[PDB]
Amino acid sequence: RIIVVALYDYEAIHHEDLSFQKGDQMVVLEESGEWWKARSLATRKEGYIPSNYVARVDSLETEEWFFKGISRKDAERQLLAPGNMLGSFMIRDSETTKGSYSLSVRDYDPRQGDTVKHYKIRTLDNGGFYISPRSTFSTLQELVDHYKKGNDGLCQKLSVPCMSSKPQKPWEKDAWEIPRESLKLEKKLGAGQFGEVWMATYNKHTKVAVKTMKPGSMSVEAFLAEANVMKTLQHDKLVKLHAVVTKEPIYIITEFMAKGSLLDFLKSDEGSKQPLPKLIDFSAQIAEGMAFIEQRNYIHRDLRAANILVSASLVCKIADFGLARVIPIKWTAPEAINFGSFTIKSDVWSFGILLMEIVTYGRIPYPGMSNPEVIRALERGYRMPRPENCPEELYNIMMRCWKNRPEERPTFEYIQSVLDDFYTATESQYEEIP
């Protein structure tokens, strides 16, 4: 028998799922991936619950200050997000020391501003934890209660835990293929050669984007094969692909990203208020999604700001992954234009142009040059001059992407690693403490 507990409020919106509240306890009756069957000790109702809205009784995940499966850089992003303050913190799964934990504290720096500092939490055997060997605690809870009442060593004392909203709710159980009836496509957002994109609703209570496809030479099953594999290639930095409408014309349902395309956002008012450190972060998140594609030996084919979507939180997500397979010369590498050889390295090139896009708020690549004009300049070894506000070192990342020889372009795994830590000397990643 296995008891879990509710981490947030949840109001049921489907036929058989249960409403519950933060603190509600439940018996687990099935583990069927994203949705679990459970009986509410509160209500006695048997029904479905999001597995990510609940965790096992008194396991650390129940603690307000604890965050499972967070990398060092997400911990930094989460902490720096609106609604946290000086001294905000979390304990989390240490990324580079398996089976261990790390403290992240929000701090302010006179000569740099708002930062996050990371401390390893130490534990061998014995049982307890310390960050400095003179100060030992038997549990993580005591650890935080100490550093909450004065910092004894650290760069900041701990106030309140890092804030966090409800997880996106998972998509409906057993709903990969959904009838068209289930959708109300409410507002047409865009319209191209290939289909349209609408803001729609799924079954009254879920906001989604829907791409509707004009029937090409691209076959029906042919298309679903691809969608089907793509839906398995889930990653935080790729747009969430929820369901498919199998019967022509095909519809594709993804999560709705409140701020639309990155290209739109940079050009938007809120866009143009964004400082460079934030612009590089976006870069890093895109590099992170592309690092994942890279690792799985795929290829995107159509990288550019117009195929990156931005959530209401300013998370960046790659869109159109896989679709470009099933179906703009300024973002495309010479090998790809001239002989049509698209590889991850031609992707690295386009990433290069995207960097330029981001750093210049969505201005067209090669402004004033036409397509033909551009193809020639490249041949003659030309590259875009460094814009104003572009750091020198970021300009060289771009230059490295635009190598003529593809095999001398960096890997995304590298680009990502440099961008993530663009403002931190390695030696400084973690804070030593005496």
Ligand SMILES: COc1cc(-c2nn([C@H]3CC[C@H](N4CCN(C(C)=O)CC4)CC3)c3ncnc(N)c23)ccc1NC(=O)c1cc2ccccc2n1C
């Ligand atoms: C629902 O499916 C998709 C939807 C979007 C999408 N576009 N828009 C805006 C972006 C800015 C646009 N802007 C408006 C303003 N504008 C103008 C000119 O006015 C310029 C244009 C308007 C539309 C969004 N806004 C919020 N949420 C979204 N999801 C989107 C992108 C890709 C897919 N599809 C796939 O990702 C996909 C297909 C696919 C197919 C097969 C396999 C896998 C597949 N995948 C993962």
Ligand SMILES: [Ca+2]
């Ligand atoms: Ca260090």
